[PDB]
């Protein structure tokens, strides 16, 4: 198993899915078409701001 | 000034060369959905009007 982690805007969470496009999906973190994993995200406005 | 949605405006774009990358590459758009066309291939495609 590979665990990947990063911080993004709340509006960008929708780009972290297979087949997505946009600045994050196209130029930061691209998921494969047949992705087998799970995407876990939580608000961090208490730590990262 | 934009139009009221009950009286939505329409403009014909024609007899011209487009570059949809100028639009899709901009970060200001909060939503850029496409139906029956893909935002990337949209710049390789051509239309009557």
Name the DSSP class of A12: G
Is the minimum CB–CB distance between B37 and chain A shorter than 8 Å? no
CA angle A7, A10, A14 (to 5 degrees): 100
Cα radius of gyration rounded to whole Å, chain A: 11
B29: left (phi over 0), alpha (psi -120 to 50) or beta: beta
Give the distance from residue B31's alpha carbon to the nearest chain A alpha carbon, in angstroms: 10
Q: What is the DSSP letter of A30?
A: P
A23, B27: Cβ pair inside 8 Å? yes
* Residue B40 · residue B46 · CB < 8 Å: no
DSSP per residue over B1-49, as a string? -PPPGGG-------SS---HHHHHT-S--S----SSS-TTGGGT-----
Cβ atoms of A16 and A28 within 8 Å: the answer is: no
């Amino acid at each position: 198993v590979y665990a990947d982690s990063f911080v993004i805007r709340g509006d960008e969470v929708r780009q972290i899915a297979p087949g997505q496009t946009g600045k994050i999906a196209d130029y930061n973190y691209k998921l494969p078409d047949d992705f087998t994993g799970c995407v876990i995200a939580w608000n961090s406005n208490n730590l990262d701001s | 000034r934009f139009a009221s949605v009950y009286a939505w405006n329409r403009k014909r774009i024609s007899n011209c060369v487009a570059d949809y990358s100028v639009l899709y590459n901009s970060a200001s758009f909060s939503t850029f959905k496409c139906y029956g066309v893909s935002p990337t291939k949209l710049n390789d495609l051509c239309f009557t009007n």
